Amino acid sequence: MQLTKCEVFQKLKDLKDYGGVSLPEWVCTAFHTSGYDTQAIVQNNDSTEYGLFQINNKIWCKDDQNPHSRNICNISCDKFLDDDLTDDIVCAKKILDKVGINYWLAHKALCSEKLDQWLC
């Protein structure tokens, strides 16, 4: 589903302040990662990223391309292509705990300035 900013702000409520990352920061992160598209899928030469949070099949989730993924999130990647972000959020928390926000953002600044712009 292609979501609006406001739908993302609502749907991501359970990430609010997780690991110190504010809800606006998470909305900014989703914008820059997928454009709020829950079906986003992006391939590079050897791996694929899925969903709103572009979760990868190298270490985070298992899929056909990489059946021996480390699968830290213990889930099939295609569960990140549906319209229920409950599991996406569970795994995004695990990603934050392990790699931090730089999983998504080349530089933290991208989502630390004028954060009130990401509110509904």
Q: Which residues are annotated as a binding site for Ca(2+)?
A: 79, 82, 84, 87-88
- Closer CB to Ca ion, 72 or 110, in the complex: 72
Token digits of residue 114: 């004028």
- Closer CB to Ca ion, 7 or 87, in the complex: 87
- Provide, rounded to whole angstroms, the least separation between the CB of residue 87 and Ca ion: 5
> How far is residue 62 from each of residues 4, 10, 24, 66, 73, measured CA to CA in Å?
28, 28, 29, 6, 9
Q: How far apart are CA 22 and CA 111, in angstroms?
A: 10
- Closer CB to Ca ion, 81 or 115, in the complex: 81
- Provide, rounded to whole angstroms, the least separation between the CB of residue 23 and Ca ion: 19
Q: How far apart are CA 82 and CA 37, in angstroms?
A: 10
Q: How far apart are CA 90 and CA 94, in angstroms?
A: 7
Known binding residues: 79, 82, 84, 87-88
- Provide, rounded to whole angstroms, the least separation between the CB of residue 92 and Ca ion: 11
Question: Contact residues for Ca ion (CB under 5 A)?
Answer: 82, 84, 87-88
Q: How far apart are CA 23 and CA 13, in angstroms?
A: 7
- Closer CB to Ca ion, 37 or 112, in the complex: 37
- Provide, rounded to whole angstroms, the least separation between the CB of residue 108 and Ca ion: 26
**AA letter at 83:** D
